Amino acid sequence: NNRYSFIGGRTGQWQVVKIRNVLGPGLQLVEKVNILNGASAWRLQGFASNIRYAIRTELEALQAVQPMLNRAEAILAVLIPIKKSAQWWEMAQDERRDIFERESHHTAVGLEYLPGVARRLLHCRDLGEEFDFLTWFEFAPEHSSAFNELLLRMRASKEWEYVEREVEVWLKRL
Amino acid sequence: NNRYSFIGGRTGQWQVVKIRNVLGPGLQLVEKVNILNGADSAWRLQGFASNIRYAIRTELEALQAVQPMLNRAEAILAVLIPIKKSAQWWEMAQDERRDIFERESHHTAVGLEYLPGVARRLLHCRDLGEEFDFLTWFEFAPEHSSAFNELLLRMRASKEWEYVEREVEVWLKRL
Ligand code: HEM
Numbered sequence A: 001n002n003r004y005s006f007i008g009g010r011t012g013q014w015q016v017v018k019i020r021n022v023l024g025p026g027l028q029l030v031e032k033v034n035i036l037n038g039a040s041a042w043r044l045q046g047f048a049s050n051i052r053y054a055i056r057t058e059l060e061a062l063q064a065v066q067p068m069l070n071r072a073e074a075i076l077a078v079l080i081p082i083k084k085s086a087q088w089w090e091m092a093q094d095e096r097r098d099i100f101e102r103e104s105h106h107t108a109v110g111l112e113y114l115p116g117v118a119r120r121l122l123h124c125r126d127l128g129e130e131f132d133f134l135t136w137f138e139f140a141p142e143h144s145s146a147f148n149e150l151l152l153r154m155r156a157s158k159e160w161e162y163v164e165r166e167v168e169v170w171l172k173r174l
Numbered sequence B: 001n002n003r004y005s006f007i008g009g010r011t012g013q014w015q016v017v018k019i020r021n022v023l024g025p026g027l028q029l030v031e032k033v034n035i036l037n038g039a040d041s042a043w044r045l046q047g048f049a050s051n052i053r054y055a056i057r058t059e060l061e062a063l064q065a066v067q068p069m070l071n072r073a074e075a076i077l078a079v080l081i082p083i084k085k086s087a088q089w090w091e092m093a094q095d096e097r098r099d100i101f102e103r104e105s106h107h108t109a110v111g112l113e114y115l116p117g118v119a120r121r122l123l124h125c126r127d128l129g130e131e132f133d134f135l136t137w138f139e140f141a142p143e144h145s146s147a148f149n150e151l152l153l154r155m156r157a158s159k160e161w162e163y164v165e166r167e168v169e170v171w172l173k174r175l
């Protein structure tokens, strides 16, 4: 099933460490997040989809180093819902690819954080959700500082001038 | 709301003229199709309107200069064409798919030849878990029927269509 739901509330596989309401309306602090592969204070949902930007040589680079989810060591996670602006979504494909990679170097920068950080990308604009993306990251604690670095590098990029809502939900695996 | 449902059955705004089961399993013949904006009938198809996946800005400019509105008074014929692409297509990277779609197959350039006669809507549905990947919608006056039939055959001859694994044509007339 390609649908995932993230329930913030009193039960789940993940303990909430902190929530940082980076930009726009936040998410209510809760005890735990329950993650369901299918369709409480809030529910987020999104789907796994096909590649939108990455080119073949980028995928090869990613495939050579990216880790799998569910490593025994990867006891920390971060769920980061993201919303991009109307101006982003009205751009053509070349315009969006150019900002994503040529200007902002998204994949190249993220590659610097592999193999330490595992990730999953979910899409949800097309479900009518209040966010556009649910991004998921997991890693061992030794990579927390580097992941915090990466977040600030991304926020400095051209791509991020089109981000209108962002929240960080920091989790620890129970 | 960006979701549309097409329900093949006994009621609706569109009368079925014919169904051509082009490739793979067909769709059951029915009297009418009922189209609902939102989430005795035989099948339901659904999809969502989405953002642009391939077209570049100059292509969008050319499309915007000529593409017609939906619901023109004269556009009494329509065709609903659900399409499924293969697993090999979806595993390709973005550049590989763009190269097939336009550089090799000229999908937008060829389609532009049929505007303004043909109006269109693209719906996506692979991400919903539907049996098809896309629902494509076309509408036009009868004087463009022959040209639309031409266009179909040209697109089926293209490289892109080597990756199409299920296709049905539901021809409709506006009630
Ligand atoms: C950890 C290393 C990272 C790598 C290797 C990486 C890599 C990628 C790649 C390859 C894509 C494009 C997927 C496609 O073509 O469809 C993508 C999309 C995206 N990633 Fe990252 N990323 C990483 C970190 C991050 C971080 C920390 C964030 C959030 C703060 C983030 C947010 C996104 C978003 C929102 C998208 C979708 C962009 C769009 O479709 O407009 N990524 N990432």
Ligand code: HEM
Binding pocket: B051, B052, B053, B054, B055, B063, B081, B083, B107, B108, B110, B111, B112, B114, B115, B118, B120, B122, B134, B136, B138, B151, B152, B155
């Ligand atoms: C009538 C003139 C047509 C024009 C101007 C046209 C134009 C386009 C455009 C510009 C796209 C890219 C949209 C995007 O970038 O996301 C698209 C996608 C598509 N069209 Fe056409 N089209 C035409 C006819 C057709 C016909 C007759 C069919 C079916 C037999 C068809 C099937 C599709 C499919 C399945 C997609 C999605 C491709 C994918 O995302 O892999 N189109 N069309």
Ligand SMILES: [F-]
Binding pocket: A119, A120, A121, A135
């Ligand atoms: F990502």
Ligand SMILES: [F-]
Binding pocket: B120, B121, B122, B136
């Ligand atoms: F189309």
